[model samples]
Target: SHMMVNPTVFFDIAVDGEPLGRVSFELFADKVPKTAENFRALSTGEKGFGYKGSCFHRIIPGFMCQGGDFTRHNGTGGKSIYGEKFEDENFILKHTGPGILSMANAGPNTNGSQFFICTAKTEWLDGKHVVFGKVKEGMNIVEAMERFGSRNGKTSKKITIADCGQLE
Candidate 1:
């Protein structure tokens, strides 16, 4: 038998120009290679377009924290390495609990660089979104960002990925 070796990545975050700590993720490469690779490469910035300096433009308590919009910095813009958009990889993974990572899209097969980290069990999104990874460490940093979320899914203070890269 063989085992899957997922890749790890991290984001050094900041809120309102202040350091907020780091949040690490373990990408489910074996299950969703395309989706996971998009995230992994974006973190490392090997393609030049990455998450660094991108802000978490949308945050909703009891829901999830969304980011990775390197272009617009808001939820309105982002693109995948494959192109402006890519097809859904697979729906094998489930949004079983908090810290689960999933692709954010406009609709079917519209995956881009945008992604979200679940703050709660989002069962409703299981089939609709491609769950590609999960938080491996620093869930508390995510919780800290949650505290600044509003009901409208916007943050009061700008939460940014000050820096990010793969973590071996």
Candidate 2:
């Protein structure tokens, strides 16, 4: 399918709906269909918002915060394995750098819902993971989110999609 490019898939999340918090980026469903569709399917109504309590497992002091594993309430293991090899590369989009969302795999074609959100320019990731989407709007938000809180799984913050509906 065409994947139904719907202009933009914006993800505006709020813990208790307090500060609105920094650390958010839109998802480009059109560009990367499979990944986008996968995200969309998970985000419909509450399934998408179900991402709640998922942790940003991989965190660095000043690099980036990696999450979206869909494993746990805070661990990337909630849902079962989705798939392995996804459309992470083509001819256009490249896994460039910061604020970028790319899948994580143990080897080639091993993606299973775990994604990393770059807090800075991770040029090292280029060509490795699929740079399916970019943080066109929330650059600084990602920067602040990089500061983060803890390494203990208990300390990992919940990165939920909040909601994922169509824009009418």
Candidate 3:
């Protein structure tokens, strides 16, 4: 049977009333269905917080920016998301490019709520993590996050998921 997956997820974020930046990402559901679905469920689904108030804990100005801590911790945080089987067979997307949102992990298939946003191209990390989304807009807001940069050159980016909804 054919499955229907939302091709995009809209993200609207800002520090103030002014529009910080807008992003439309092509969510990777075919490759990592469980993780992708969990993300969507947590966002546009009932009984979910939709990733609001989460901060981008790890940030690298030029190379990458990491986030997605459920418990609000910096380094050692987040819990395991079960029912997600690793799928490295298909390199569905690349992580070294700007606006890419991929999972973070120590060993393969060990994604636990940590993610990195690419500010620059990183071909090295291309096939390593799961690439599920891209920043279709407001990349400047993400890039400008450097201004609010955190310790050791991280973005105090305060990446609140803001809101997540599927295409109408």
Candidate 4:
């Protein structure tokens, strides 16, 4: 049998329903089930708060574009649906691409509700961050985010996730 098990979750992102183009993600649940579940639930609103309206709080040209802090809309806030932090999956995934999605944490075992999409290969974060997903579409939109803000500052333009839910 030729079986094709598709990803059951995704992160849907947009900005003002206008520019930046389309963007979406497909999580690696089989590899990082717990980490994937955290983002899947938080993003789809299946939990208390979804990632809707959350902004890409951090942007670094040669690093990544981060968000999922719908709580404070900044990097300082955001928690798991469980109301506390969880352990990192520490999957063997690599941060060697342009659209990788990985958990954002304060330190080890602090995987919360925040995440970042890589704008470039970040070898420094290879084993530090948990890479759970990748942008299935709209690499250009992810690229646009790095350009949307000042190279050293955050963007106030409100880079929101209009919707983030399961794919299947």
Give the TM-score of each candidate: 0.97, 0.66, 0.74, 0.87
Instruction: Report, for every candidate in turn, its global Cα lDDT versus the true structure.
Output: 0.92, 0.54, 0.63, 0.77
Give the 10-residue window scoring lowest on summed lDDT in candidate 3: 80-89
Residues forming the 10-long window of minimal summed lDDT in candidate 4: 2-11
lDDT, ranked from best to worst: 1, 4, 3, 2
lDDT (Cα) of model 4: 0.77
CA shift at 125, candidate 4, in angstroms?
A: 0.5
lDDT (Cα, tens digit) per residue for candidate 4, span 47-133: 667787677888877778888887788788888976678887775899987889998899988878999888878888888899998
- Output the number of the TM-score-best candidate: 1
- 3 versus 4: better TM-score goes to: 4
**Model 3 residue 63 distance off true place after TM-score fit, in angstroms:** 1.2
Candidate 2 segments whose C-alpha is farther than 4 A from its true place: 1-7, 12-19, 22-26, 45-50, 73-92, 149-168
Predict model 2's lDDT versus the native. 0.54
Instruction: Give lDDT tens digits, candidate 2, residues 1-168.
Output: 545544444455443333344333466656666665555454443443334444455556455556665545443353422543454444256555677776665656555566667656777666666655666676765565555534432323544444434343
Clash totals in order: 0, 11, 5, 0
